[PDB]
């Protein structure tokens, strides 16, 4: 019946004066626009159909055409920015927000989905959806005693839409919308469905990607222990955003970082720093670098949790980007740590893989590593042990590498080298 129509036939039906003919034609459009490959989105836009779909959203008397037109527009809105823009330009936003109240679950769900694609386009559309008042009726759909009674697909869509309202920066979402959304997100973060959990963690990761004030508003909600728990999940799609959120939190203040440690996070790092997914090791090591940038009592906790040998491991062998994060974690540990914490680092065997990484063609990591060596030499001075360290650096071939570096392009680099060379070698 409505399979494989041409655009011209769809146009003909939609322009007929006959609501049933318009409904069949709209459903045909929904079918073109939902096919597996190359849906003809631009052809539908160019035929001028968006304004007719939008006014069909308002047909309370004909719920099937509301659904077909909502689904058609969702898919248009799922494409490029210019395509999402055409949906918005047709007035879709307030019309979808009014469908949130529909007594028909499949229809308010479609409106949720459409609004998520719109808000998902970027900050300006996200904030426009919020100005049109989307958040109150979105949140009313989740106002039930027990999330478990909602259909699973429906809750997943709501969660994902709310996370798009939390997403993007420049600017970040309005502080008041974030405050409005957060209690419902905290509730979603304790739900048992893995996709709900993954998207709740993504939303939390967006909200903590910002200055300390933004981080604080999340941390004040008490979510950190739940995040650390998800950090332990067996599902990679949950671990990845849980770890991103935890990593974002530890770029905040030392007190915000302490909440992550207090919640047990460090005990998960032995598995994270050896995780077979490269991106998990990289972001675990990034996270560690922002903890070793903390107070000496926080460095101490990294030590007590047995994590220095794990840093030595990733420095010795890892994808290069993870290794660059490990080099940072080490330079941070060495500028902030006590002499005894620094001595410990050397006893776990940091020197040889630090030196091996001096052969990399990345000026930044070379800078980072010479800073670290200089820091470690500073500790050895206070102990009168600079010579013991010079030799260690000699024996694993580090001296060769530092010498060469005198003849290096960069200023810090050849500057940093000559200094160590002339100071201890």
């Amino acid at each position: 019946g409505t399979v494989n129509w041409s655009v011209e036939d769809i146009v003909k039906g939609i322009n007929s004066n006959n609501l049933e003919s318009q409904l069949q034609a709209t459903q045909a459009a929904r079918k073109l626009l939902s096919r597996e490959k190359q849906p003809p989105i631009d052809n539908i836009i160019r035929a001028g159909l968006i304004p007719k779909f939008v006014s069909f959203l308002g047909k309370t008397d004909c719920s099937p055409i509301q659904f077909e037109s909502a689904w058609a527009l969702t898919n248009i809105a799922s494409g490029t920015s210019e395509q999402t823009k055409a949906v918005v330009d047709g007035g879709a936003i307030p019309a979808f927000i009014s469908l949130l109240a529909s007594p028909h679950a499949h229809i308010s769900e479609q409106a949720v989905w459409a609004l998520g694609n719109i808000a998902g386009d970027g900050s300006a559309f996200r904030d426009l959806v919020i100005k049109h008042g989307a958040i109150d009726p979105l949140l009313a759909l989740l106002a039930v005693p027990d999330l478990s009674t909602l259909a699973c697909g429906y809750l997943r869509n709501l969660t994902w839409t709310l996370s798009n309202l939390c997403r993007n920066k420049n600017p970040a979402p309005p502080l008041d919308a974030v405050e409005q959304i957060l209690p419902t997100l905290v509730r979603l973060l304790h739900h048992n469905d893995p996709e709900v959990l993954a998207d709740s963690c993504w939303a939390i990761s967006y909200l903590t990607d910002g200055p300390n004030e933004r981080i604080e508003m999340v941390v004040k909600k008490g979510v950190v222990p739940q995040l650390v728990k998800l950090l332990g999940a067996t599902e990679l799609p949950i671990v990845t955003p849980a770890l991103r959120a935890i990593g974002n939190i530890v770029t905040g203040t030392d007190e915000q970082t302490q909440k992550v440690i207090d919640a047990g996070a460090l005990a998960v790092f032995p598995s994270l720093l050896t995780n077979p997914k490269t991106n998990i090791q990289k972001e675990a090591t990034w996270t560690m670098s922002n903890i070793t940038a903390g107070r000496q009592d926080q460095i101490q906790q990294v030590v007590n949790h047995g994590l220095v040998p794990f840093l030595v491991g990733v420095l010795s062998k890892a994808d290069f980007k993870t290794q660059k994060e490990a080099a940072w974690a080490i330079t941070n540990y060495t500028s902030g740590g006590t002499v005894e914490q620094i001595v410990y680092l050397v006893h776990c065997g940091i020197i040889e893989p630090l030196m091996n990484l001096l052969s990399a063609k990345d000026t930044k990591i070379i800078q980072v590593i010479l800073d670290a060596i200089s820091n470690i030499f500073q500790a050895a001075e206070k102990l009168g042990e600079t010579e013991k360290l010079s030799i260690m650096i000699e024996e694993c071939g580090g001296l060769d590498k530092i010498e060469a570096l005198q003849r290096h392009e960069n200023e810090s680099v050849y500057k940093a080298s000559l200094n160590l060379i002339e100071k201890y070698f």
Partner: peptide, 7 residues
Amino acid sequence: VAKKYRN
């Protein structure tokens, strides 16, 4: 992905 097409 920020956007999702309904198949």
